[PDB]
Write a protein that binds this ligand. Structure first.
Ligand code: HEM
Ligand code: HEM
Ligand SMILES: Nc1ccc2ccc(CNCCCc3cccc(F)c3)cc2n1
Ligand SMILES: Nc1ccc2ccc(CNCCCc3cccc(F)c3)cc2n1
Ligand SMILES: Nc1ccc2ccc(CNCCCc3cccc(F)c3)cc2n1
Ligand SMILES: Nc1ccc2ccc(CNCCCc3cccc(F)c3)cc2n1
Ligand SMILES: C[C@H](O)[C@H](O)[C@H]1CNc2nc(N)[nH]c(=O)c2N1
Ligand SMILES: C[C@H](O)[C@H](O)[C@H]1CNc2nc(N)[nH]c(=O)c2N1
Ligand SMILES: [Cl-]
Ligand SMILES: [Cl-]
Lengths: 362, 362
């Protein structure tokens, strides 16, 4: 069954990819080659062109992503040549540096060798390459609760954090053939962080909030033409609400709205005062202001939705069906001020695509 | 087929209803009676108890409603006895008066005779019993665009509005056997309206906004045990976001956010300033403040979601399955500050329930 599944996915992908690349005439011959290769080896290897375009298609097909207008400008780094943990580490460091680009963030994906027999070659444990630790013990909560299980796993392995609310987790990944992952502390020279200040409320800095500049998601599987790239970290840049409305606001994350209300000078006593809503707006204004001030790319949810409308229009012009997940595309503040709220989307799954996979810790 | 459909719905409803009322032992005999009645007449008539409990169950099963905690306190007015247009008009006037209750709004439904052969006895044209007219001509837009087609239909019938932005539409409904509906101007003594002011921005009154106190939805069909009550106007009280985030804010409704931004003293020039979000918060604060000041019932979205969580808990305690439509239950401002955003809901349709039906105008 496995081989047949692979061959079917390969036939669909190659046809579509080569069609999009103006290479329709090469399909027959390429498919023949792939079919022999599957017979004799159990798999097939993508050309560089296939791999690049496949990673772009996968972004274009990500139903939950409002940022898809820019799918064709993904910078694809092909690292299928890595064999050692130093090579992996150095590729991840490189990805951070080139994606960061001094703050003018470049959407980038680094693709490592794919699973073979469902056997991973490289297994990345980080949820994002840059992310803060979380601790919970003796009633005491420090840092990012979303990171508690991974933090615990790192500390089992000899890493120890300073126990600030913003400790950078080490890179942590496992190689085929090793029982345990290895970990490496992130060089601070590679990591841009943004202190959160507010454009006109001076006290906002008293909250001592910060966040990291570049979200590099490193635990999803890229599937292209039946090949499973389980290790393929990618990034765009933030939409401000991801930080201001969720990471810093959720009760199960940094839970900052009461503190925000206090520094902006409003009571947090009555639901009818809409103080949470007001605090959310000011915290989100601060996040956008702060990234812009530090010269780190970010987009607000209004501009993001406007770009997404153009993506809808582009798909139409291209004669491509549009898929989307309304429940994730709407922003978590003022969703009905965006066009997204007022239309519906077909949440069908089209491949190539990015998929969740099981956590190796937990 | 029609009769079989009716009988099946009747069997399911009576069983469930009588179970909930502690009348399980009466089911067999009641079903027998209903079955003969369907045979001989083509339909059956609900007892008063059945009708009351059925309208309550229908509210309880309304997946899109965040207000369902209070389903069992619905005041059910049985008007299956009406035969004349004066009786209909007077029942609608009565519903407005008793539901309004001097501002301490009573959730109420008035139930008119049901369809017979799919033949309506009374057909109400209003979307809500109290609602503002809309006009669009010669580029000129006045009032509520959502009401343009019904307004045009009323004016075809000899009604003429003053062409303010808040003209009250007349009651308009048709009787079986009449070709045209009749219309009646609403007595202003029956209609409470709330001027919108802001708790601390004095200029907010310069916008001259107002809204009506009680939303009385009068164009949905109540279905109970296979009987179709197409005319059964009901009301609760507003959640503030329905007025402040949608009716007064949507670009295709009163479209007030730029004007709000100006009176609250913020620029409406840059998406990154989140001025729409800020204007939405202040407009919603004003709406809640204004209703509370006038002594007219209203609920904010935080308190509403907290009540809805108790509804979820109540259903659990009662051993009843919960259904809901996440896409409608989340409020349109700060949705992720409510528990609703963070869970999922089974959007299955359970009857009794309230359903949309085709507009007789348009
Ligand atoms: C260029 C800037 C980009 C922006 C502003 C953007 C925006 C976003 C946002 C706001 C989300 C929702 C995240 C959440 O709520 O957890 C998201 C989801 C997603 N994005 Fe994008 N994105 C961008 C680039 C990318 C890139 C480069 C890729 C992959 C190549 C990608 C793939 C996805 C995927 C797979 C999800 C769903 C994650 C879960 O499920 N995005 N995007
Ligand atoms: C007691 C106060 C009540 C509150 C605060 C409340 C709240 C709401 C809200 C905010 C909506 C969404 C409306 C929209 O966005 O267009 C809604 C929908 C709905 N409500 Fe309730 N509701 C209440 C009472 C009732 C009652 C008494 C009934 C019927 C007996 C009812 C049946 C429904 C139905 C059928 C919908 C879906 C309408 C479309 O689809 N609600 N409710
Ligand atoms: N005490 C701490 C904690 C975390 C820290 C993280 C980063 C840094 C220093 N970051 C410098 C990043 C400069 C930079 C600029 C442009 C591109 C790039 F990749 C890095 C210091 C920290 N100091
Ligand atoms: N700006 C972007 C671009 C791409 C993105 C891809 C994935 C995600 C993360 N989605 C959430 C993964 C599940 C989750 C939720 C909350 C906390 C947590 F640690 C993980 C954010 C992105 N944000
Ligand atoms: N120019 C206008 C336009 C619309 C109007 C609507 C209502 C009224 C007067 N409304 C009085 C309502 C008083 C009231 C109190 C308690 C219960 C109740 F049903 C009505 C005047 C208008 N005047
Ligand atoms: N507070 C309540 C209680 C019950 C409600 C029942 C129905 C509705 C109306 N739902 C919208 C019907 C479709 C629609 C959307 C926008 C404008 C318009 F005229 C009609 C509001 C309620 N609001
Ligand atoms: C339970 C629910 O699906 C959950 O809150 C979802 C809803 N929509 C979302 N949308 C985005 N963009 N991100 C999220 O984390 C979520 N959470
Ligand atoms: C097109 C989309 O379904 C539409 O905007 C829905 C979404 N959620 C909603 N939720 C509520 N409560 N009311 C609405 O009018 C809508 N509109
Ligand atoms: Cl994040
Ligand atoms: Cl309304």
């Amino acid at each position: 069954e496995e081989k047949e599944i692979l061959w079917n996915e390969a036939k669909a992908f190659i046809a579509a990819c080569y069609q999009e690349l103006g290479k329709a005439a090469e399909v027959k011959d390429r498919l023949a080659d792939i079919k022999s290769e599957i017979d004799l080896t159990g798999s097939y290897v993508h050309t560089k062109e296939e791999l690049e375009h496949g990673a772009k298609m996968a972004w274009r097909n990500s139903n939950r992503c409002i940022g898809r207008l820019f799918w064709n400008s993904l910078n694809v780094i092909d690292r299928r040549d890595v064999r050692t943990k130093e090579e992996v580490r150095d590729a991840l460091f490189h990805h951070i540096e080139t994606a960061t680009n001094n703050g003018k963030i470049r959407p980038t994906i680094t693709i490592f060798p794919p699973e073979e027999k469902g056997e991973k070659q490289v297994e990345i444990w980080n949820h994002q390459l840059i992310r803060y630790a979380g601790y919970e013990s003796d009633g005491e909560r420090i840092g990012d609760p979303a990171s508690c299980s991974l933090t615990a796993a790192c500390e089992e392995l000899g890493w120890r954090g300073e126990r600030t609310d913003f400790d950078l987790l080490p890179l942590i990944f496992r190689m085929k053939g090793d029982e345990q992952p290895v970990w490496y502390e992130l060089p601070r020279s590679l990591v841009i962080e943004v202190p959160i200040t507010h454009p006109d409320i001076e006290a906002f800095s008293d909250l001592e909030l910060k966040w990291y500049g570049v979200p590099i998601i490193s635990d999803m599987k890229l599937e292209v033409g039946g090949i499973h790239y389980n290790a393929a970290p990618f990034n765009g840049w933030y939409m401000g609400t991801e930080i201001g409305a969720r990471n810093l606001a959720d009760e199960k994350r940094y839970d900052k709205l009461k503190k925000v209300a206090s520094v902006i000078g409003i009571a947090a006593d009555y639901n009818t005062d809409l103080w949470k809503d007001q605090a959310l707006v000011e915290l989100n204004k601060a996040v956008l202001h702060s990234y812009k001030k530090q010269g780190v790319s970010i987009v607000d949810h209004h501009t993001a939705a406007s770009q997404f409308k153009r993506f809808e229009e582009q798909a139409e012009e291209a004669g491509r069906k549009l898929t989307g997940d309304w429940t994730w595309l709407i922003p978590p503040i003022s969703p009905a001020a965006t066009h997204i709220f007022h239309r519906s989307y077909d949440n069908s799954i089209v491949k190539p695509n990015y998929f969740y996979q099981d956590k190796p810790y937990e």
